[PDB]
Amino acid sequence: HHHSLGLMIKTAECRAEHRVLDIGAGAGHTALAFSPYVQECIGVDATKEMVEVASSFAQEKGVENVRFQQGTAESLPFPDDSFDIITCRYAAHHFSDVRKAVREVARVLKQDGRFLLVDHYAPEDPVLDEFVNHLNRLRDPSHVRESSLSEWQAMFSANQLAYQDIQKWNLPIQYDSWIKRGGTPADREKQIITHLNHASDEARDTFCITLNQNGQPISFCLKAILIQGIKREG
Template sequence: MSNNAKAKVQQQFGPKAEKYRDSSVHAKGADLSLMVESAKLSGNEKVLDIALGAGHTALAFAPYVERCYGVDLTEEMVQEASELANSRGIENVEFLRGDAEDLPYPDSFFDVVTCRFAAHHFSNIKQFVSETARVLKPGGRFLMIDHYAPENSLLDTFINDVDRMRDPSHVREQTLSEWRYDFEQSGLIYEEMSTWDLRLEFANWVERSATPANVRHELVKFLQTAPSHCKETFDLQFNEHGQPDSFCLKVVLLQGTGVRPLI
């Protein structure tokens, strides 16, 4: 990740760590249980959560594994996650500041690696996936949840423009075909486990990111004047005053399985 991109992430999330601790999108949701179930845990695993955030994913896994590690680029997020673990009496966790594109762990160290609602902030996805494959044991599971862009170029451009207007640290929602290519190039067996629409309430969405008022105004106009195909695909809903009320992001749970070496 470039230094400029890293700075944007730290500026965006450092002062807002508490908001992401309390955000229902990040703290709750059936997708957390789906992630844990998909890992097919035995209780002996070492798990790494990349882009830890406020710790919700790591703490969902911790009761079912030997030890859960977590890294985040933002020190405030690491502190928030550590405090949340302490408040819940969860001790088998180890969180530190670290870069998704340069992981501070040895090769083939983890049984499971997770990343949830974060990859769209990474400027070098190929390096992120390569690093994930490196630290994953042969036969281990990489489980990733993120919103993705449709294959249609108009829809791809539209949703990435929307996200970037709201949050300048947003880099890109990839298409599923792009994710498949990156997984396979890093030696991971690619599988789409589940896809769904995530409905977001517009006012809460821009409040959580502290989007400036003038940018919110531009974003509202952008959504109001969007092509009908974009409004339909992302199920844009407007109130009686024509203001955006809610919309849906396209979300996927991907699994990448580490390939065992040939004997």
């Protein structure tokens, strides 16, 4: 995943003196990437098991200035106007209330502070929408929703956040490995496979469905993007 991550560093326009907050931080890859360039990274993740991974991994790469902690995006501990940068990467489709999360991002971000949000997203067409969302709840039962770009813009505007699409790009997925990494049972996998085999034309177009002649999926694409948001006023 080095591309999404590099873009954020290019787009973030770091400063020696900045403080960074990585939300849904995971094994903490974003949080570490930033570390050489900013003062301090803080990262939150909901699962405690992930805080530990993150924090030991930090230690393993011996970086002093990043630290992880447990919490949720819908309720960040931190004070208002207390970060220059916030990163959120392939985590939002997991939040149980993305509306609130943005509101919190808004709160805790400083004025003219930047929100670098990377994720994949539903196309505007609701039918294509369901398609890509249903393909992912099937793979990952923890998948809440990948909101659409209209939706992201409406949320940004709703929170005095100035929306800019830095760059889109298709996310190739190699079906076979995607399944492994995701741990899915062969029950669900059969539903995934039916799903991909009965794709509308529009669907197998928009998501690059490539299949073995036996119906067995080779590959497809998610729609990745990097929105950047900047806290202005209302």
